[PDB]
Amino acid sequence: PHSMRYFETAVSRPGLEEPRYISVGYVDNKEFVRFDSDAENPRYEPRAPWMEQEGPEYWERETQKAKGQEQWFRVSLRNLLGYYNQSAGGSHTLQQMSGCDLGSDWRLLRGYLQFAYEGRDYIALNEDLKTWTAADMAAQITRRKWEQSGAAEHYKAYLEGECVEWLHRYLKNGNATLLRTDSPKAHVTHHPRSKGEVTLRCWALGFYPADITLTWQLNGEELTQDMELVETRPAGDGTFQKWASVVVPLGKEQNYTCRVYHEGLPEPLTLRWEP
Amino acid sequence: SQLKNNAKEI
């Protein structure tokens, strides 16, 4: 399985004609291109090494598309001000996510088109790529307008066509980096907690991709409802970090084992506190 | 290569 997504944000700037618009492309959850209207000379830039394989014609065409989107978001932002009886003079945000997932059979598994206003669900294209799910009353206005205009067909065509074509290309071009792993480096630390009780923390560092599972066991059972699991966070060098901790009786630390599961590990790691 | 939205705005 594999995916391409563009994540777009327009933020209105009070008194100003143009919003700030940012578009970020992802393949398999790795940022690979970015456009930002706030630059001196706004242009799409590569964000993954393997996008060096595209020539100047690619960057020109995609740059022109971004400026088109910026205008589409400008007009939409104004329309939304009216739907919600909002005064101008404040900032508002409009976001879009779109793209496609490929299955293991390498065909289109699903296409996506979703919009959010003020960080809340607004309208989405249904999986059928024909009907819309409008989140509130204002969005029903848009749903009816897009049904009237037959907007969905145009989106369907991109998602089943150009989205799939380009994701295949990016996967081929980026194969050697996108298909790689960096298995976690793991260790257990030991910490004071409270009277007669200590914390064991099982660390996983420098891993890629970000998907991972950490578990703790006592007497052959997972501590499902009894561990603190930190949110996965970037190391800042392209790899990720996570940890899982448990509070345990002082003197019983050796009864606990941490397991680490990751694509880069043929067999899961089994770890313990080692004083 | 990203989607150009339908000429129809929100």
Binding site: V11, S91, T93, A116, G119, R120, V230 | -
Partner: protein, 99 residues
């Protein structure tokens, strides 16, 4: 609707006093996207703080990574201070080498 940021402050590598490292302040789950982030050494702003470009996650919420070179020591404190409209006052979170 305003979503208050979650903040993690943590080193890129396991810390060793006297050895250079990178300190990260990862700020997530916030809305709207405007945010102001400072990193501090003993209550003083660190001048060379780099800021990632901003992104948003599948739940629509924004995220950003601030980072700077640092050398952990026994007595210096490090923290990240975040100012966001979801909060009445800036939130300061200390680096804890155990987390």
């Amino acid at each position: 609707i305003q979503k208050t940021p979650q903040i993690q402050v943590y080193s890129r590598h396991p810390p060793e006093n006297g050895k250079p490292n990178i300190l990260n302040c990862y700020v997530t789950q916030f809305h709207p996207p405007h945010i102001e982030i400072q990193m501090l050494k003993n209550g003083k702003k660190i001048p060379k703080v780099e800021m990632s470009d901003m992104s948003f996650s599948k739940d629509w919420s924004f995220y950003i990574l601030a980072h700077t070179e640092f050398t952990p020591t026994e007595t210096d404190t490090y923290a990240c201070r975040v100012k966001h409209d979801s909060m009445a006052e800036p939130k300061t979170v200390y680096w804890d080498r155990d987390m």
